[PDB]
Amino acid sequence: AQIDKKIHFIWVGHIMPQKNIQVVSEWAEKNPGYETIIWVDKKIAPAKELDLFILDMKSKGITVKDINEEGVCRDSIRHELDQESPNYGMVSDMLRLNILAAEGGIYLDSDILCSAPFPDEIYAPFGFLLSPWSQGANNTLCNDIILCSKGNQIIQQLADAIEQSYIARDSFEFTHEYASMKETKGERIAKTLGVTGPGFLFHQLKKMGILNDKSEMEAIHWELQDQRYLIDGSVKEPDYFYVPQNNTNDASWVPSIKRPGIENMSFQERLENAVQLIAFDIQKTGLFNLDHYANELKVKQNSWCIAAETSPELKPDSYLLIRPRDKTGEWTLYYVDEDKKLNPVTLPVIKGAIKLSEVSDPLRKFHTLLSQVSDPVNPTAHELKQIGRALIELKPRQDEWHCKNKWSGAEEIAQELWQRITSNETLRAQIKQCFTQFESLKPRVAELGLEH
Numbered sequence: 001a002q003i004d005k006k007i008h009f010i011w012v013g014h015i016m017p018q019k020n021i022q023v024v025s026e027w028a029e030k031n032p033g034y035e036t037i038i039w040v041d042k043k044i045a046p047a048k049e050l051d052l053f054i055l056d057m058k059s060k061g062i063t064v065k066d067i068n069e070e071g072v073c074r075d076s077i078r079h080e081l082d083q084e085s086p087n088y089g090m091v092s093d094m095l096r097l098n099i100l101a102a103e104g105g106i107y108l109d110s111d112i113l114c115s116a117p118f119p120d121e122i123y124a125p126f127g128f129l130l131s132p133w134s135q136g137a138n139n140t141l142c143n144d145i146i147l148c149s150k151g152n153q154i155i156q157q158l159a160d161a162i163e164q165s166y167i168a169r170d171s172f173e174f175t176h177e178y179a180s181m182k183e184t185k186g187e188r189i190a191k192t193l194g195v196t197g198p199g200f201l202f203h204q205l206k207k208m209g210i211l212n213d214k215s216e217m218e219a220i221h222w223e224l225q226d227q228r229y230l231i232d233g234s235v236k237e238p239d240y241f242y243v244p245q246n247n248t249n250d251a252s253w254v255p256s257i258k259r260p261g262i263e264n265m266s267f268q269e270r271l272e273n274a275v276q277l278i279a280f281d282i283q284k285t286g287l288f289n290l291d292h293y294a295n296e297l298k299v300k301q302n303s304w305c306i307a308a309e310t311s312p313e314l315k316p317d318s319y320l321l322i323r324p325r326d327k328t329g330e331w332t333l334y335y336v337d338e339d340k341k342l343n344p345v346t347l348p349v350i351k352g353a354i355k356l357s358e359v360s361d362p363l364r365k366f367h368t369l370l371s372q373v374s375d376p377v378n379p380t381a382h383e384l385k386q387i388g389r390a391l392i393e394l395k396p397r398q399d400e401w402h403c404k405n406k407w408s409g410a411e412e413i414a415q416e417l418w419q420r421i422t423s424n425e426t427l428r429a430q431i432k433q434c435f436t437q438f439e440s441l442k443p444r445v446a447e448l449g450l451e452h
């Protein structure tokens, strides 16, 4: 079967970084007979920035598709994306299989460079191909390059299996290879690699018989495998892919980062999100992992807003940044206090301060950021991304201009989640285990444990 002539990249969360966009543009330009698609999730993305990103991509002749619009976002994937700090590596690992099942084509990470164009037609004996190359290494297994024909049954089986693997992620034991991975790499990386990444893929290919008894996790031995599953039907290094020695991969998913806009949501919105997420965990696995949710919800970073003018309705205890009316104008930052009153924040002079204390000044570094903006009337998606990042973490030395971020503590939140979930008789009955270390709650968990 022929590999469908589409090259798929995924970027969920905030807007794809400029470096990755450049990588995608190079793929698109070197492979003009292929449709290049970037996949996004409009449900968690910041709307204005995504709209500007999409327009940019259209101007460049890159298609942008939304995972929900196209129907490739399984409820399991929605579950991870709606977390306050999603694991975008897990998300992408799952989306790539669903996308390929639906459309066919070639999935590629945005941290792989194009060394040579693909053939005009790629023909796959079993409708599915992997690369023996990944991240600068030959004779290896990875999930960052995957080719299939639309509707391929191997890819469909992998998509179904990865859902099951993901659903069972709390049950992941760090034994065998993953014992040591946990130790060196951290639980987050080890778990990601084993539940949705190349460790998952290894085990699944072994179970399906695609990899035989000679293949091991640390030594895939493609030269002893059925090479009809490989691009070009060979273990030889493909012509198509390149990375620099000094950056074999980005590891962009490793940091745990709040998804866009969490700091601007109400407590009630965030609480209801946690409840819905907990309900899914309970219905699918019977596990109520209370502390995960309470520990996300306890985080309140600065609320903020970038506008053209002062609104009717302001958010108490927030930053309000006002764009210049003309490219030569000045920006105005206000701290909106807890009584919804505007407090003009003074942005310090960028040129005239050579003292190390002034260089470190949060407000001077902010003004310098604003000063680098190309057209302040019409900031780009990436400029808005960086301004928004600065405002989330802006902590002035002046207390009068510092957000308060008064918020419930972890344990109080956990108590509220406990009550909300267990007061639903249906969910309460579906709980098999609850993980909490909160002293007020460990006993409420025992008392339910025995009720059953």
Ligand SMILES: O=c1ccn([C@@H]2O[C@H](COP(=O)(O)OP(=O)(O)O)[C@@H](O)[C@H]2O)c(=O)[nH]1
Residues within 6 Å of the ligand: 009, 010, 011, 012, 013, 014, 088, 089, 092, 108, 109, 110, 111, 144, 249, 250, 251, 252, 253
């Ligand atoms: O904020 C982020 C970070 C990562 N990713 C996804 O995670 C994938 C893997 O990231 P990367 O290639 O940097 O990881 P590595 O290959 O180094 O494990 C990317 O291709 C994206 O699809 C994402 O959607 N949003």
Ligand SMILES: OC[C@H]1O[C@@H](O)[C@H](O)[C@@H](O)[C@@H]1O
Residues within 6 Å of the ligand: 089, 090, 092, 093, 109, 142, 143, 144, 192, 193, 196, 197, 198, 249, 253
């Ligand atoms: O599983 C997390 C990450 O693992 C890496 O080995 C792959 O190159 C990525 O595409 C994947 O997202």
Ligand SMILES: [Mg+2]
Residues within 6 Å of the ligand: 109, 110, 111, 112, 144, 249, 250, 251
């Ligand atoms: Mg990568």
